[model samples]
Target: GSSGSSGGVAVEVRGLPPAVPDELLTLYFENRRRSGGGPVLSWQRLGCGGVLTFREPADAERVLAQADHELHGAQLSLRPAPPRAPARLLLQGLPPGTSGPSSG
Candidate 1:
């Protein structure tokens, strides 16, 4: 095999909903080249997930750097140590029976 493209890990992309298309991601990533970036060598749509291979290993981290990505209203942040911010309560009120903070 001459000039065969070789990549690493293939950047497994999980959590692709039924609405999202494989080509959508391919084009989206390939376009990154415009901003001092590289292009994807190939797009491997695994049965359980999708893997985006690149011409170079560094490309893998480049994609990851763009952590917050939303396409077609679909959030795609595939990686570990995903931020888990505290979800504060909304319009929550405590029962009056307790009166824990009563100051009469």
Candidate 2:
């Protein structure tokens, strides 16, 4: 329960209130029915501006793909993130592919 740690954090766009509160859009995308969105995993803010990240990174921009464009006075800056943060991590047991038999 502190600060600064590696974890979930997608969906990047533009046009938003400089001093806009994080929660304002938090619930927006969090509500699938409201904006045809998904669960929000992180909220990124800096220099009088902000954006959001989602638990559904693999489905990048999936929300904006369906949701309406208008968001109150400002059009929802909600758009797909350009993989600013790593999306899919690659890993393998060892070297190239290998199917070990039932026994050595």
Candidate 3:
């Protein structure tokens, strides 16, 4: 039930070196504060790729814009996370004639 606009924007970070620790990644973003200044709300590791959620959408944008310039020695890339699709489920109960789509 995750909506694309539920909270701050998620950023995808890819190509991080395997030796790099999670704390280092957290500190990297934490130190890169925008003029408006917001902290990263969460960090989830996914293989070599990870997702970071900022306190504000704008904060994420700011980091994405300048991260490449400020970072070095790592083949890292940052981008806006794709919007999560809302989940859909079909329950088995109503028949086609009684209350299903055909009823309309």
Candidate 4:
């Protein structure tokens, strides 16, 4: 189900010591834990550009924030979501009118 496309924001990382490769880069994200259940994180490399998808804008923010120190010297930019269309919301099947206290 992974198309390896950068769905949400496209952030670029530099100062990688010139030794890191696409494989390593992909491994880093693939191994990182998702904020929400399921595979909420995905990415794709467009030549020199990389695309990172988050379950929501917040997830993407969380990832970037958490990586701030580690990603020092790396440049980051947020690309607008696909043209005008609203983001896709994938929810697990649930009964109608589900309501409960969510753990923040």
Q: Each candidate: what lDDT? A: 0.59, 0.60, 0.67, 0.46
> Which scores better on lDDT, 1 or 3?
3
The Cα error of candidate 2 at residue 44, in Å, is 0.4
Every candidate's CA RMSD = 17.1, 7.5, 8.0, 10.5
Candidates' TM-scores? 0.55, 0.57, 0.64, 0.36
Model 4 residue 39 lDDT score? 33
> Candidate 2: minimum summed lDDT over ten consecutive residues — where?
1-10
* Number of the candidate with higher TM-score, 2 or 3: 3
- lDDT minimum window of 10 residues, candidate 1: 1-10
Segments in model 3 whose C-alpha atoms lie over 4 Å from true places: 1-7, 33-37, 67-72, 85-104
Q: List the residue pairs that clash in candidate 2.
A: 10-53, 10-54
User: Sorted by TM-score, highest first, which candidate order results?
Assistant: 3, 2, 1, 4
How does candidate 1 fare on TM-score?
0.55
Candidate 2 clashes: the total is 2
Q: Which one wins by TM-score: 1 or 4?
A: 1
Model 2 over residues 3-41: C-alpha lDDT tens digits? 243445456657766554667667666766666557777
- For candidate 3, the 10 contiguous residues with the lowest summed lDDT are 95-104
Question: Candidate 3 lDDT, tens digit per residue, 1-104?
Answer: 33234445788888777677767676777675422226878888788878878777877777777656222357677777877544466665653434545553
* Candidate 2 displacement at residue 57 in angstroms: 3.2
